Structure formats: C-alpha cells, structure tokens
C-alpha cells in the first residue's frame, strides 16, 4: 500500500468523479452476475434469477453503496488498511466464511466497473495504481485468517 | 462451457471491436505490465515502454488468435493446440498469468464500448477467455 | 488431458486402493474440514466431529464418483454431467474448494500407499483430480 | 500463525523426526515434478526431462536442503515469520518475480511428503496445524509484495 505520490494523485482525482450511489451496485451486481456461485452469500436479497433481476434489486445497489463505502474509508487510510478492516475482517471471515479468494474477484470487478464508466480517462498507468489499493484492501480483509 | 447465449454474446461483442482489435491486444499487455510486473519476466526480448513497436506487433498477434478462437468458438481445442504447445511445452507460462490478461482484456473492452459491455456480455466474455485460458493451459492439465 | 501414461497411472493406483475407497474418502472431508474450516459452510446438517457416520456415510458418495470418473475417464464430462448440476447449480460451490479437496484427496492416498505414491503417479493423481475439478465446475465454466 | 500449544506439540514432534537431507529434495523434486512451469526458474540445475532426472539430480537434492532449512528457521520463529524471511523475501519476490501462488504450492507438496514419509502418524489434526504453519511462511515471502 505503497502508492508513489504520481500513483496518489491518479487514485484521488479519478475517486471524486464517481457516482459513489450507483457504482457500489454495479460491482456488487456484476459480481453476483459473472461469478454466480457468489449468489450463495445473498440468498435473503430476493430474486437474482437473471442479470436483469439482479441489477434492479433494491437489496443489491443498497449494498453496493455500503462496499463501496469501505473502499473510500480504505482509500483515506492507505497508510494503515489493517486496521481499518478489523472489523470487517472478522465480520467476513469468522462469521461468512467468505473464502479470500473472492475478496480479489470483487476488486477487479469494481476495477472493470471504472473503467467501464471512465473509458479513455482509465487509463493503464491509472489502473495499475487501483491494482495496488484494491490489492490492498483484499489483504485487509483477509487478515483474520491468519 | 459456453451456452447459445454466450457463443452469441461473444461473436457481438467481438463484432464491435472490429478493426481495433490489434490496438486493443497491444492495450492489454501494455495494462497487464503494469498492473502486473511478475508477468515481464516473459519478455525479456521486449521493450515494454509505451510506445514499444514490438507490444504493439504482438498485440495483433494475441488479438488474432482471440479471433480465430471466436471463429471457431465450438473447436477451441484443436484451433488453439498449436498455441497450446507454445505457451505450455516451451515457454513454461504459469498458469497463474491466464487469468491476470484476460482480466486486463475485459478493462480494455470495457473501456472501449460502454454500450456493449453489459453484465450479460460481461460474463460471457469471461467464461470465453476462460476457455480459452484452459485450452492454452492443457498440455499441464 | 491426461496422457495414456497418466490414465494408466491412475487405475492403478485406484485399483490398489480397493475396498478402501470409501474409508479413504471420508478421511480426505475430514482431512478438509480441520485443515479448510471454511468449507465447513456447506454441510450444516452434517455432524462434522471424528466418527460421524454422516461424513463416513458420504466419503463412500465422494469416492464411489471418483471411481465412476476412473472407470470412464475418456468421458468423464457425460459421466459425471449429473454431479456437475448439483455443484455448480443447486449448491453454488465455489470453485476453490475443489483444489482443497484434492489436496486432501492426495495427502490421504499418500498416508495410505507408500510404494505406490512416485512422483510420477503424484504428477498423474493431479491431473486427474483437476480433471475432475473441471467437469464438476463447468456449469460455471 | 497462532498455534494452540496442542497444535505446537505436533508440529514440534514430527519435525524431529524428519530427515533433512531427503525431504528437502523430495519436495523440491516433486514441484518440478507436478507442477511443470515451476521448471522455468531452474533451467541451470540442469537435466530435467524426466522425473528419474529431476529426482537423482543433484542439484535438487542440494537446494532442497536449504528450502527445508528455512522452513525449520520459521518454525522456531513462527511470533515473527515476516521478519525471519526480509531477506527472501525481498529475493523471491523483486528479483526472482516467482508469484506467490507458487508458494502455496511448495508448501502444500512439503505437505504430501511429510504424509507420504510418516503415513498413519500424520493424522488430520496434524495436517491441518501443518496447514496453518505452511500458509504462515507463504504469506511471509509474499509480504514484499504488498
Ligand atoms: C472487497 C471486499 C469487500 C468489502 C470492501 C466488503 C464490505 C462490506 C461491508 C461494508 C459490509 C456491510 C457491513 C455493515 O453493514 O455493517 C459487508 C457485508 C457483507 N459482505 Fe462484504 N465486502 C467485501 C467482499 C465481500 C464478498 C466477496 C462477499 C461474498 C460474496 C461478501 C459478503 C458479504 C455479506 C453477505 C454481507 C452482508 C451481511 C448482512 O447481511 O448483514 N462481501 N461487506
Ligand atoms: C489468452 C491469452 C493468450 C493468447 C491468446 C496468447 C497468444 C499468443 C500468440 C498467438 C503468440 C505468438 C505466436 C507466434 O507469433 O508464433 C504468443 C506468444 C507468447 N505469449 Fe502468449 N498468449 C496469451 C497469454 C500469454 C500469457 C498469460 C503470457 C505470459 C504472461 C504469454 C507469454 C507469451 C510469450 C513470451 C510469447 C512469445 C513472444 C515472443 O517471444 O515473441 N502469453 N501468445
Ligand atoms: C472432486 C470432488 C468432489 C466430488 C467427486 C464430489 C462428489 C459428490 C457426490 C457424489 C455427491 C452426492 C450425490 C448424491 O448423494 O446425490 C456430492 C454432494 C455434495 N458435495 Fe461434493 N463432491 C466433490 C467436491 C465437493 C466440494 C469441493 C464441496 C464443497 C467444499 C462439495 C460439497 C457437496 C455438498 C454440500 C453436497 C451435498 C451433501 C448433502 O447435502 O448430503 N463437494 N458431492
Ligand atoms: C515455500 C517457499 C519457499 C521457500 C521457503 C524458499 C526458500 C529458498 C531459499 C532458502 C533459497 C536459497 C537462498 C540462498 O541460497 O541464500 C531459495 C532460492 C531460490 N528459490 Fe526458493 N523458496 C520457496 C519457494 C520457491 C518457489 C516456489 C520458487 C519458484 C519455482 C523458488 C525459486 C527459487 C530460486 C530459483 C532460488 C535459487 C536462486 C539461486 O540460484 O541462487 N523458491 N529459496
């Protein structure tokens, strides 16, 4: 969770630009669309039988916004992503028993998700920086396994 | 496996990306370089700057074996055996390296058609570079 | 893809596993659900302490499946279609814990058959249960 | 990297009774044996076409040796294994560019020789608190990556 000062300035102009309402369900509802067995986690957010289902469900870009809200709280405490998580950490892992691996799937979605709604400006010097943080923030979470 | 669904959601969507193809094959090494350093190990022989001519001739490269794959999407396997050899049997490619372009592949054409790129072409294009991954990572399976 | 090396390394090795499959396959869950706690998520309504005779009553499930992909292994996508469903659709599981399993798959024929676990055979087991891994998570594929 | 005193008094036990020598080799052989792309970055151990070449070959067994002893270095050190591997790390990691998934993998065919070695004596319970310690010493060498 280095971040050059170069890389710093990518991540925080890019994260004020977007639409923090409806991105945190994007990702969260792509996640459950291309990675279906996800869907097992949200089984009590109602009907996901198809991608339409799952993007319009109320349940879903209501939780997207709160994901995406440890994602702006992580993103203003790079310099310590550990403990910024514990709490979460346990929620996810003594408690879902969401397997870490997952934890990366959702950051690379999210990362698709701004580049889907930034285009040209995302660029890879751009990405590579959200590689790191979401990186990050994947460890974060995962630490209560250790 | 690829359902009719996805087979067309795959052809449509590689439909949009037309004669961008090359350039959108040089954009994802280029992505997956930075995004990924462990992975320039392969390509010692390269210059891996920006503008490298040589990132950007093997664009075209990785770019039309995507499109031979998509042209014979239910034959994968013995379209792609030549490739299969290459990238398992000389170059040693780790598995692991697979999944981190094709993530770089749906950024790019993420970032190039915002119209096309809905969830439903979204896992589609997924499960495609997914078995295209499998195929090239056989001669180990 | 499994060579015709491989495929003969793998009936014999199953074959000197015998009537033992069952019991060698509620020792690789158990094997699992110690080392991998997190994949104890998927069996609720199981009892998971040493002698349950629900996780003994399903080692014989597990393995008496392997041993219809080794009797079959040139088919093992029809074969063992049915299991894919119950996998990838009905219980979700995520396709991680099928390479846990597997590793507990071979630490437990490795306990159990000294003279028979070559690094051959290990290289071959592997293939094998990826193999495995593959078809049963291809409705995801 | 907890370990219960439990846990500590199988690890310690079995690990005393382990030949060095041999299973260190037997480890490192089998990777290269099983996992074929891990062969890249021994290309000057040189013969290994086949698993008779790779496991008589002496240069294997060689290094195998030295794997083993960092595992033992770690296992004595298990309060502090990021600190114990700074240095490999560093190696592994921003100059020999292995991924870390291929760390998991060593540790888990460590694993397969220690149960192909002491069979029975390698019950569940010590498997899985062998899990815990190989996850510990991936996660270490990995660090350099954050
Ligand atoms: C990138 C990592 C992730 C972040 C940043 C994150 C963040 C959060 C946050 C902020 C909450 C809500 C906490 C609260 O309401 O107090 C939460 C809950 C939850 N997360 Fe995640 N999460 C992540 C990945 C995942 C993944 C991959 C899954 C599994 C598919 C998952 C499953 C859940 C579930 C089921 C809940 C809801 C618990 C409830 O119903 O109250 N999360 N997560
Ligand atoms: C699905 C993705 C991939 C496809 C479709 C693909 C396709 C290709 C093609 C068509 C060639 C060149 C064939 C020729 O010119 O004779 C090639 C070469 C190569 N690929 Fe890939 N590749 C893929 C992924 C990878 C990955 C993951 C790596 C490693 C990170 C890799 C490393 C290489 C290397 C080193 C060469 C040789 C380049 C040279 O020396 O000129 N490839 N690939
Ligand atoms: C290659 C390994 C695997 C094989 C061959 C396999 C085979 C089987 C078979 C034959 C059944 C029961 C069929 C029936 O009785 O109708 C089954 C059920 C099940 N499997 Fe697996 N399985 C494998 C891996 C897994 C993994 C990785 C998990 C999760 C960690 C899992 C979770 C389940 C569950 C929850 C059931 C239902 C059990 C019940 O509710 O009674 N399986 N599996
Ligand atoms: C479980 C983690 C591993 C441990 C404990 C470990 C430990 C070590 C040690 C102690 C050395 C020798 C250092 C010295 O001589 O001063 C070393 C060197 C090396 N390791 Fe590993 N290693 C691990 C995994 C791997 C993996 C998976 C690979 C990649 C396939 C790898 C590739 C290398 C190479 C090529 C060297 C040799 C460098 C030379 O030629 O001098 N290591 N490792």
Same mark, same amino acid.
């Not at chain 1, 349940?59 to 702006?72: D, Q």
């Not at chain 2, 193809?21 to 320039?40: D, H, I, N, Q």
């Not at chain 2, 392969?42 to 042209?71: E, I, M, R, W």
């Not at chain 2, 950024?107 to 090239?136: G, I, N, Q, R």
């Given at each position: 969770?280095?971040?050059?000062?170069?890389?710093?300035?990518?991540?925080?102009?890019?994260?004020?630009?977007?639409?923090?309402?409806?991105?945190? $369900?994007?990702?969260?509802?792509?996640?459950?669309?291309?990675?279906?067995?996800?869907?097992?986690?949200?089984?009590?957010?109602?009907?996901?039988?198809?991608?339409?289902?799952?993007?319009?469900?109320?349940?879903?870009?209501?939780?997207?916004?709160?994901?995406?809200?440890?994602?702006?709280?992580?993103?203003?405490?790079?310099?310590?992503?550990?403990?910024?998580?514990?709490?979460?950490?346990?929620?996810?892992?003594?408690?879902?028993?969401?397997?870490?691996?997952?934890?990366?799937?959702? $950051?690379?979605?999210?990362?698709?998700?701004?580049?889907?709604?930034?285009?040209?400006?995302?660029?890879?010097?751009?990405?590579?920086?959200?590689?790191?943080?979401?990186?990050?923030?994947?460890?974060?979470?995962?630490?209560?396994?250790? | 496996?690829?359902?009719?669904?996805?087979?067309?959601?795959?052809?449509?969507?590689?439909?949009? @990306?037309?004669? /961008?193809?090359?350039?959108?094959?040089?954009?994802?090494?280029?992505?997956?370089?930075?995004?990924?350093? &462990?992975?320039?190990?392969?390509?010692? /022989?390269?210059?891996?700057?920006?503008?490298?001519?040589? @990132?950007?001739?093997?664009?075209?490269?990785?770019?039309?074996?995507?499109?031979?794959?998509?042209? /014979? @999407?239910?034959?994968?396997?013995?379209?792609?055996?030549?490739?299969?050899?290459?990238?398992? /049997?000389?170059?040693?490619?780790?598995?692991?390296?697979?999944?981190?372009?094709?993530?770089?592949?749906?950024? &790019?054409?993420?970032?190039?058609?915002?119209?096309?790129?809905?969830?439903?072409?979204?896992?589609?294009?997924?499960?495609?570079?997914?078995? @295209?991954?499998?195929?090239?990572?056989?001669?180990?399976?």
């Amino acid at each position: 969770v280095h971040l050059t000062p170069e890389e710093k300035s990518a991540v925080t102009a890019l994260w004020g630009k977007v639409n923090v309402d409806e991105v945190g $369900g994007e990702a969260l509802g792509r996640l459950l669309v291309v990675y279906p067995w996800t869907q097992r986690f949200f089984e009590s957010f109602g009907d996901l039988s198809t991608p339409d289902a799952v993007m319009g469900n109320p349940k879903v870009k209501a939780h997207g916004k709160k994901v995406l809200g440890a994602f702006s709280d992580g993103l203003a405490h790079l310099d310590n992503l550990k403990g910024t998580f514990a709490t979460l950490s346990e929620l996810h892992c003594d408690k879902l028993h969401v397997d870490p691996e997952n934890f990366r799937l959702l $950051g690379n979605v999210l990362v698709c998700v701004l580049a889907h709604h930034f285009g040209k400006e995302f660029t890879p010097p751009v990405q590579a920086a959200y590689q790191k943080v979401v990186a990050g923030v994947a460890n974060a979470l995962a630490h209560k396994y250790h | 496996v690829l359902s009719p669904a996805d087979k067309t959601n795959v052809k449509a969507a590689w439909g949009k @990306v037309g004669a /961008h193809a090359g350039e959108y094959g040089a954009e994802a090494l280029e992505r997956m370089f930075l995004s990924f350093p &462990t992975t320039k190990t392969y390509f010692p /022989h390269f210059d891996l700057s920006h503008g490298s001519a040589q @990132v950007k001739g093997h664009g075209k490269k990785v770019a039309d074996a995507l499109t031979n794959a998509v042209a /014979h @999407v239910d034959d994968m396997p013995n379209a792609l055996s030549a490739l299969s050899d290459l990238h398992a /049997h000389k170059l040693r490619v780790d598995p692991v390296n697979f999944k981190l372009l094709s993530h770089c592949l749906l950024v &790019t054409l993420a970032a190039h058609l915002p119209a096309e790129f809905t969830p439903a072409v979204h896992a589609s294009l997924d499960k495609f570079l997914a078995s @295209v991954s499998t195929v090239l990572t056989s001669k180990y399976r």
